[PDB]
C-alpha cells in the first residue's frame, strides 16, 4: 500500500546489483535494507565494509543515507540476505543508481494513484510490472513512450481511469523583466512591434505606453540566463534605429 | 535437534564436572551453538547468537561472570569471521578452530601455575578469599613443588565459599586456618600476600566478584601490601561502573522493605563488589603478568574500532 | 621573589602593532578583539571560531604572480596567527587543527586554477569540524546518558563546552530527572551563562561559588563532570583554574569524578607542575572608586590571575571520549592508535 515488491521474487535473486542504507552497526556490521524492497532488510559484514577498519567516528557518518551494492549469498526463506558493496565497480553508481532513480520516479506517480484514489499500491503495480518491467526495460521511460505510444495503455486493462488521467498531468519557470520603453519619438511603435516579433516567438505583456512585463520562460532555471540577456540585446539593438529611448531593469 | 538456550544444552554439562567453571561453559556452549546449528549464511549466525546470548543474559542475570563469556564469544567470532574468508572456509574455518578454548581455556589455569610459581616465595603467609580457582591450581603447583608457605582462608560470607577451601586443601597437606571475615583488620598486620580472583575484569581492573573483595582490598592498601589478584586471559568484560556500584542482584543495595514472614535478612545487601585499579597492583593472564594499567589497554585495543 | 613566579614570562602585555607588510585580513583582528578585551569562549568554542575565519581569510585568496598557492599561504595565514598570539596564546584545540591544516597546504600541486580551490579546501575543512567535532559529539551523547540515572545531581565547574548540549539531552530530549549544580569564579563569570541556559531550558540549577563549595558537597551529591583544556600525557588534566579544588574534595568525599573530553584535545606535551607552563591575563581584573588601585607604582603588591592548572590523574575516575571511556593513566594510548591514524 505504501511500497511493494518490484519484480515477483521474495528476494533479490543471486549476483543482482541493488542500493541499501546503513541503519546502525554495532559489532556485526550494518542492519540494511533493500531500498527495492523496502521493508526486507539483509545485513552486511565488516570486512565487506570499506578494507581500511573504520574507524567509530568514521562509522557513525554514513548511517541513514543510502548507496549502492551487489548481494552475495539469499536464504531461500530467511530475509538474513549477504550484501557485497566492497566488490562493486563505480559504474554501478551509472548502471543501478539512475535505473533506481527511474524507478525512484515512478514510486512518485504510483502514490497518489493509490492513497489519493484510496487503493493498495501493489494491484495497480502489478497490473504493470510484466507487461513493462518484463517484456523490455522498467515503465518510467517507457512512461515517455506512452504518452505518444499508446499500445500500451491498451496493451493492459485500466482496472481504474483515473491513474490515465493522473499520469499525463504530472509528467506532461518564469523569470520577471520590468522593461522600460521611455521612448520620446515617431518609429517607436514599429520598433516595439518588430521586438514583439521575436522576443515571444517568452510570455510578453502590456502594462502601458513605457511599461511592459515579460515572464522569460526557463527550463534548467539558469537557461533563461540566455534567454532574457539576448532579450535585452535584442531592446538595445533596436531603438537606435528607430528614434527612442528603451530602458531595462 | 536441540536449541541451546537453558538446559537443552547448557546446564547438560555443568552437573557434569565442578572443574568447568562459569564463563567457558557457556564458551562450550556457544561454540557448539553455531556447529551444530551452521546456517549456511553469515547473517543470520551472529542473528542466531544475538538472540542466544541476550536470553542467557535473561536466563541469569546475576552471574555476570556469564556476560564476560558473552562478551568475548563475540569478540572471538568477530576476528575469526575477519582473514576475509567470504564465508566460505569461514564456516570450516571457524570450527577448525572450533574446540580451541576446551583445548586452550581448559589449560589457563594449569598455565597461571606454570608463571604464578615465584609470587608465593619462601615463608609467605596467603590470604585469599573465595573459590577462585586458579587460586587453588596455583596452590596445587605450590604444594607440588615443596615451596615452604602457609595459609589463611577468609569466609566468603554469604556464599559460603571458605568452608570449601579449608576442607580443599588441609587434605592437600597444608597448614592453614580459616578466619572470619571480620578479623581481617587486626590480622593483616602479620599477613604479607593475599591473593584473590575476580569472575570479570572492568575497563580499569575490575573486582567483580564477591561480597568485599574492596573490603578486603582497602584494608591492604593501607597495610601496604601487594594485593594481587588471580585470574586468566578470558575474564573480560566491558561493564565497568564509576562507584563500587555495579548491576546489583535485583534492587538497591539500600533496602527498607520489611520482613513479611521469615524472609532472609543477612541477603538484603549486595553480593558482588567493585574494586577499581587504584587497590590492586598486578595480575596473572594466560599472556603473563599483567600491571593494572596494560589491563586497561589490552580491554581497549580490541573493544574500540 | 622566593617563588618569582611575576618573573616566569609565559605572556607579556605588548600591543600597538602598525606594520602593513602583510594583507592582515581586518575580521581575523575583530575575533583578536572579541578575545583579550573580555573573553567569549571555552576551548572548542576557539576551535569553531578560529575556523570560522579561516574559511572566509582563504576565500580571500589575493596570491601573488610568482608565488605557488602552497608557497605563500603557509606564509599568508601562519603571520596571521602572531596577530593572536599577541592576544592570546594557542591551545592544542588550536593546535591540532592548524598542523592538519599546514599538511593540506602541503598536499596541493601546482594544479589549481584557484575555482577549484575552494571546495577542495571548504568542504574537507569543513568535514574536518563536522567529524571531529560534531559527530564526535554525538558519540558523547549516548556513552554519557547510560551512565547517568534519573533523579540524580551533575555538579559541573565554569562553562561547559561539550556537556551543555549533555545536559541538554538527559533533561530534554530523555526528560529524566537532574539537578543541576553549577559553579563558576571570580573573575570570569563564564558558568553565569550556562546558568542563563540550563533555567532558559527549564530544569532544576544551583548556582554555586568556589568559596562555598563544601555545603555543596553536605547534601545530596553524586557525578561530577568537568569540561576541559587539554589532557596531559600522564593524565593530568590542563583546564580551567580552580578545578582541582573540587576535584580533590569530590574524590575525598568518595564519589567519582568524570572529565568531559575528546580525542582532539590530547596532547604529546608532559609536565606534572600547576606552576610551569600557564598563562597570565592582565592583572587589572581582579579589581572591580574602587577599593584598592595601584598595583603597578606601590611598593611590595602584585596581582596574578591563574587560568589554566593541573588536577592530579588520581582525582580523575573515569575519563571520556567519542571512542569510549577510559581509566585517567591509559590516555596516551590513543596517541599512538588514533590521534594522526584514525
Given at each position: 500500500?505504501?511500497?511493494?515488491?518490484?519484480?515477483?521474487?521474495?528476494?533479490?535473486?543471486?549476483?543482482?546489483?541493488?542500493?541499501?542504507?546503513?541503519?546502525?552497526?554495532?559489532?556485526?556490521?550494518?542492519?540494511?535494507?533493500?531500498?527495492?524492497?523496502?521493508?526486507?532488510?539483509?545485513?552486511?559484514?565488516?570486512?565487506?565494509?570499506?578494507?581500511?577498519?573504520?574507524?567509530?567516528?568514521?562509522?557513525?557518518?554514513?548511517?541513514?543515507?543510502?548507496?549502492?551494492?551487489?548481494?552475495?549469498?539469499?536464504?531461500?526463506?530467511?530475509?538474513?540476505?549477504?550484501?557485497?558493496?566492497?566488490?562493486?565497480?563505480?559504474?554501478?553508481?551509472?548502471?543501478?543508481?539512475?535505473?533506481?532513480?527511474?524507478?525512484?520516479?515512478?514510486?512518485?506517480?504510483?502514490?497518489?494513484?493509490?492513497?489519493?484514489?484510496?487503493?493498495?499500491?501493489?494491484?495497480?503495480?502489478?497490473?504493470?510490472?510484466?507487461?513493462?518491467?518484463?517484456?523490455?526495460?522498467?515503465?518510467?521511460?517507457?512512461?515517455?513512450?506512452?504518452?505518444?505510444?499508446?499500445?500500451?495503455?491498451?496493451?493492459?486493462?485500466?482496472?481504474?481511469?483515473?491513474?490515465?488521467?493522473?499520469?499525463?498531468?504530472?509528467?506532461?519557470?518564469?523569470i520577471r523583466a520590468d522593461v522600460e520603453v521611455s521612448c520620446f519619438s515617431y518609429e517607436g511603435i514599429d520598433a516595439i512591434k518588430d521586438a514583439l516579433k521575436s522576443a515571444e516567438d517568452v510570455k510578453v505583456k502590456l502594462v502601458a505606453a513605457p511599461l511592459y512585463v515579460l515572464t522569460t520562460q526557463a527550463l534548467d532555471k539558469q537557461k533563461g540566463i540566455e534567454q532574457l540577456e539576448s532579450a535585452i540585446e535584442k531592446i538595445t539593438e533596436v531603438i537606435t534605429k528607430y528614434g527612442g529611448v528603451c530602458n531595462i531593469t | 535437534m536441540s536449541e541451546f538456550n537453558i538446559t537443552e544444552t547448557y546446564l547438560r554439562f555443568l552437573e557434569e564436572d565442578t572443574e568447568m567453571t562459569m564463563p567457558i561453559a557457556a564458551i562450550e556452549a556457544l561454540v557448539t551453538l553455531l556447529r551444530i546449528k551452521t546456517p549456511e549464511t553469515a547473517a543470520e549466525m551472529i542473528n542466531t547468537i544475538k538472540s542466544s546470548t541476550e536470553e542467557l543474559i535473561k536466563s541469569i542475570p546475576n552471574s555476570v561472570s556469564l556476560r564476560a563469556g558473552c562478551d568475548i564469544f563475540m569478540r572471538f567470532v568477530l576476528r575469526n569471521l575477519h582473514l576475509?574468508?567470504?564465508?566460505?572456509?569461514?564456516?570450516?574455518?571457524?570450527?577448525?578452530?572450533?574446540?580451541?578454548?576446551?583445548?586452550?581455556?581448559?589449560?589457563?589455569?594449569?598455565?597461571?601455575?606454570?608463571?604464578?610459581?615465584?609470587?608465593?616465595?619462601?615463608?609467605?603467609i596467603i590470604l585469599?578469599?573465595?573459590?577462585?580457582?586458579?587460586?587453588?591450581?596455583?596452590?596445587?603447583?605450590?604444594?607440588?613443588?615443596?615451596?615452604?608457605?602457609?595459609?589463611?582462608?577468609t569466609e566468603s560470607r554469604p556464599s559460603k565459599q571458605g568452608n570449601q577451601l579449608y576442607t580443599l586443601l588441609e587434605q592437600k597437606g597444608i597448614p592453614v586456618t580459616l578466619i572470619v571475615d571480620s578479623a581481617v583488620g587486626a590480622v593483616i598486620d602479620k599477613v604479607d600476600k593475599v591473593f584473590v580472583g575476580a569472575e570479570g575484569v572492568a575497563e580499569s581492573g575490575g573486582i567483580i566478584?564477591?561480597?568485599?573483595?574492596?573490603?578486603?582490598?582497602?584494608?591492604?592498601?593501607?597495610?601496604?601490601?601487594?594485593?594481587?589478584?588471580?585470574?586468566?586471559?578470558?575474564?573480560?568484560?566491558?561493564?565497568?561502573?564509576?562507584?563500587?556500584?555495579?548491576?546489583?542482584?535485583?534492587?538497591?543495595?539500600?533496602?527498607?522493605?520489611?520482613?513479611?514472614?521469615?524472609?532472609?535478612?543477612?541477603?538484603?545487601?549486595?553480593?558482588?563488589?567493585?574494586?577499581?585499579?587504584?587497590?590492586?597492583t598486578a595480575l596473572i593472564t594466560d599472556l603473563g603478568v599483567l600491571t593494572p594499567s596494560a589491563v586497561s589497554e589490552e580491554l581497549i585495543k580490541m573493544w574500540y574500532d | 621573589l622566593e617563588q618569582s613566579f611575576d618573573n616566569s614570562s609565559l605572556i607579556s602585555s605588548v600591543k600597538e602593532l602598525l606594520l602593513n607588510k602583510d594583507l592582515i585580513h581586518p575580521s581575523i583582528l575583530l575575533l583578536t578583539s572579541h578575545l583579550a578585551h573580555y573573553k567569549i569562549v571555552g576551548s572548542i568554542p576557539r576551535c569553531i571560531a578560529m575556523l570560522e575565519v579561516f574559511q572566509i581569510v582563504i576565500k580571500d585568496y589575493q596570491t601573488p604572480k610568482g608565488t605557488t598557492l602552497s608557497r605563500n599561504l603557509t606564509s599568508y595565514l601562519s603571520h596571521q596567527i602572531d596577530l593572536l598570539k599577541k592576544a592570546r596564546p594557542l591551545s592544542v584545540t588550536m593546535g591540532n587543527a592548524i598542523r592538519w591544516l599546514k599538511q593540506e597546504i602541503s598536499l596541493i600541486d601546482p594544479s589549481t586554477p584557484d575555482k577549484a580551490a575552494k571546495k577542495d579546501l571548504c568542504e574537507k575543512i569543513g568535514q574536518?569540524?563536522?567529524?571531529?567535532?560534531?559527530?564526535?559529539?554525538?558519540?558523547?551523547?549516548?556513552?554519557?546518558?547510560?551512565?547517568?540515572?534519573?533523579?540524580?545531581?551533575?555538579?559541573?565547574?565554569?562553562?561547559?563546552?561539550?556537556?551543555?548540549?549533555?545536559?541538554?539531552?538527559?533533561?530534554?530530549?530523555?526528560?529524566?530527572?537532574?539537578?543541576?549544580?553549577?559553579?563558576?569564579?571570580?573573575?570570569?563569570?563564564?558558568?553565569?551563562?550556562?546558568?542563563?541556559?540550563?533555567?532558559?531550558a527549564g530544569v532544576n540549577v544551583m548556582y554555586a561559588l568556589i568559596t562555598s563549595l563544601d555545603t555543596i558537597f553536605n547534601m545530596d551529591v553524586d557525578y561530577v563532570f568537568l569540561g576541559a583544556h587539554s589532557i596531559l600525557s600522564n593524565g593530568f588534566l590542563y583546564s580551567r583554574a580552580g578545578t582541582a579544588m573540587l576535584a580533590m574534595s569530590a574524590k575525598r568525599r568518595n564519589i567519582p569524578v568524570l572529565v568531559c573530553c575528546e580525542s582532539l584535545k590530547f596532547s604529546q606535551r608532559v609536565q606534572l607542575d600547576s606552576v610551569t607552563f600557564n598563562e597570565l591575563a592582565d592583572p587589572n581584573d581582579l579589581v572591580n572608586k574602587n577599593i584598592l588601585d595601584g598595583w603597578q607604582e606601590l611598593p611590595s603588591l602584585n596581582i596574578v590571575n591563574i587560568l589554566y592548572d593541573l588536577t592530579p590523574p588520581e582525582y580523575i575516575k573515569k575519563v571520556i571520549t567519542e571512542f569510549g571511556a577510559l581509566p585517567p593513566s591509559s590516555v596516551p594510548v590513543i596517541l599512538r592508535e588514533y590521534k594522526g591514524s584514525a
Open positions: 500500500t505504501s511500497h511493494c515488491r518490484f519484480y515477483e521474487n521474495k528476494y533479490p535473486e543471486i549476483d543482482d546489483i541493488v542500493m541499501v542504507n546503513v541503519q546502525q552497526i554495532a559489532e556485526m556490521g550494518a542492519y540494511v535494507k533493500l531500498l527495492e524492497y523496502d521493508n526486507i532488510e539483509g545485513m552486511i559484514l565488516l570486512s565487506e565494509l570499506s578494507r581500511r577498519r573504520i574507524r567509530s567516528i568514521q562509522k557513525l557518518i554514513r548511517v541513514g543515507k543510502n548507496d549502492v551494492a551487489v548481494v552475495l549469498r539469499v536464504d531461500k526463506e530467511k530475509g538474513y540476505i549477504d550484501l557485497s558493496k566492497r566488490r562493486v565497480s563505480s559504474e554501478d553508481i551509472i548502471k543501478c543508481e539512475e535505473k533506481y532513480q527511474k524507478s525512484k520516479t515512478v514510486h512518485s506517480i504510483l502514490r497518489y494513484c493509490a492513497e489519493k484514489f484510496q487503493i493498495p499500491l501493489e494491484e495497480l503495480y502489478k497490473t504493470i510490472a510484466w507487461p513493462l518491467s518484463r517484456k523490455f526495460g522498467h515503465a518510467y521511460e517507457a512512461f515517455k513512450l506512452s504518452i505518444i505510444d499508446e499500445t500500451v495503455w491498451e496493451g493492459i486493462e485500466p482496472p481504474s481511469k483515473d491513474v490515465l488521467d493522473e499520469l499525463k498531468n504530472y509528467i506532461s519557470v518564469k | 576475509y574468508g567470504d564465508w566460505e572456509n569461514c564456516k570450516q574455518h571457524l570450527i577448525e578452530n572450533g574446540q580451541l578454548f576446551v583445548s586452550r581455556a581448559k589449560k589457563s589455569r594449569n598455565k597461571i601455575a606454570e608463571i604464578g610459581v615465584d609470587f608465593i616465595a619462601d615463608d609467605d585469599v578469599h573465595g573459590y577462585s580457582r586458579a587460586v587453588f591450581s596455583l596452590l596445587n603447583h605450590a604444594a607440588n613443588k615443596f615451596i615452604r608457605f602457609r595459609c589463611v582462608v566478584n564477591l561480597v568485599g573483595t574492596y573490603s578486603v582490598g582497602v584494608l591492604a592498601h593501607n597495610a601496604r601490601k601487594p594485593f594481587y589478584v588471580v585470574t586468566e586471559s578470558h575474564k573480560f568484560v566491558r561493564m565497568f561502573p564509576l562507584s563500587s556500584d555495579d548491576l546489583p542482584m535485583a534492587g538497591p543495595p539500600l533496602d527498607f522493605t520489611r520482613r513479611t514472614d521469615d524472609l532472609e535478612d543477612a541477603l538484603r545487601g549486595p553480593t558482588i563488589d567493585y574494586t577499581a585499579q587504584e587497590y590492586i | 574536518f569540524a563536522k567529524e571531529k567535532i560534531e559527530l564526535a559529539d554525538q558519540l558523547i551523547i549516548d556513552n554519557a546518558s547510560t551512565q547517568i540515572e534519573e533523579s540524580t545531581t551533575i555538579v559541573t565547574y565554569g562553562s561547559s563546552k561539550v556537556l551543555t548540549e549533555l545536559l541538554l539531552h538527559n533533561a530534554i530530549s530523555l526528560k529524566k530527572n537532574i539537578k543541576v549544580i553549577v559553579v563558576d569564579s571570580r573573575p570570569l563569570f563564564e558558568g553565569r551563562k550556562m546558568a542563563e541556559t540550563l533555567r532558559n
